[PDB]
Amino acid sequence: HVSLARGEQSVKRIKEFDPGKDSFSVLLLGIDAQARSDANVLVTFNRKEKTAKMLSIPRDAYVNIPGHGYDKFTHAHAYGGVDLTVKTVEEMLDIPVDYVVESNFTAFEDVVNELNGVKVTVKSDKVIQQIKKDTKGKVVLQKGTHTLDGEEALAYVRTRKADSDLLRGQRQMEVLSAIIDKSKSLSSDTMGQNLKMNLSLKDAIGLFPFITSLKSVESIQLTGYDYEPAGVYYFKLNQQKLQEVKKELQNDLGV
Ligand SMILES: CC(=O)N[C@@H]1[C@H](O[C@H]2[C@H](O)[C@@H](NC(C)=O)[C@@H](OP(=O)(O)OP(=O)(O)OC/C=C(/C)CC/C=C(/C)CC/C=C(/C)CC/C=C(\C)CC/C=C(\C)CCC=C(C)C)O[C@@H]2CO)O[C@H](CO)[C@@H](O)[C@@H]1O
């Protein structure tokens, strides 16, 4: 239960925040343990409409890191940890980031296994083959609809050599929505040191009924083009798509 430097609620919110009645956002960061945040997924929950929209932020996105200038998005966590990542997201999308969850491999695997695996419909032989290479044959997935365990799901959300980081972000949002779906079919705290978030376990349980009864789940994608001036790769964002995304998330959050 880490406390954000910003204080009580997001500085982007104009009115007082009511976590039980207001639409809210959650930033999910996956750490590859010096440790780096290679997974970056923002989920915005529209309370009134009972909808959630997932957005993967390309780790190479060319964005302003407050106090550091334009750089790769993932460098915000490297420079200033979770606090600076939250600030970078709020400036980039001009929306409040209400909650943040930081996870390493172990928390992810334990969560998946606690849910008795997550359902994924694997469809690409190239993805299957690259995961085999990634894991030196420890993880061998099958095409079709199957339940993956923690080790299999982790390799699935990590692979990328067969296909860009944007396809990896789509595999992350795919697995995230499968985790939510599998938590629906549950009965009714050893993850410490592996899962850090800015709210208590109690407050998290309070949101579970709402999160597990959404009418729709959608994925959003920030489009762009490669920007490689001097041997450093950035992903410049399409400013029209960025604005459309900002408007959609602002409207979803009531701002
Ligand atoms: C040069 C160098 O320094 N080294 C070299 C080489 O390095 C390679 C990598 O090998 C190479 N890797 C690969 C695979 O291809 C690639 O690097 P990479 O892309 O950085 O990936 P990597 O670090 O492996 O794994 C990490 C990738 C990730 C994507 C992060 C995953 C972490 C997670 C935690 C899972 C996230 C999953 C999600 C679905 C997202 C959202 C959910 C969560 C975040 C968590 C929990 C959520 C909960 C509980 C529920 C709450 C729900 C609500 C609140 C609503 O490239 C490198 C460079 O060429 O390594 C060799 C030895 O191995 C060395 O000899 C070499 O010198």
Ligand SMILES: [Cl-]
């Ligand atoms: Cl696939």
Ligand SMILES: [Mg+2]
């Ligand atoms: Mg990494």
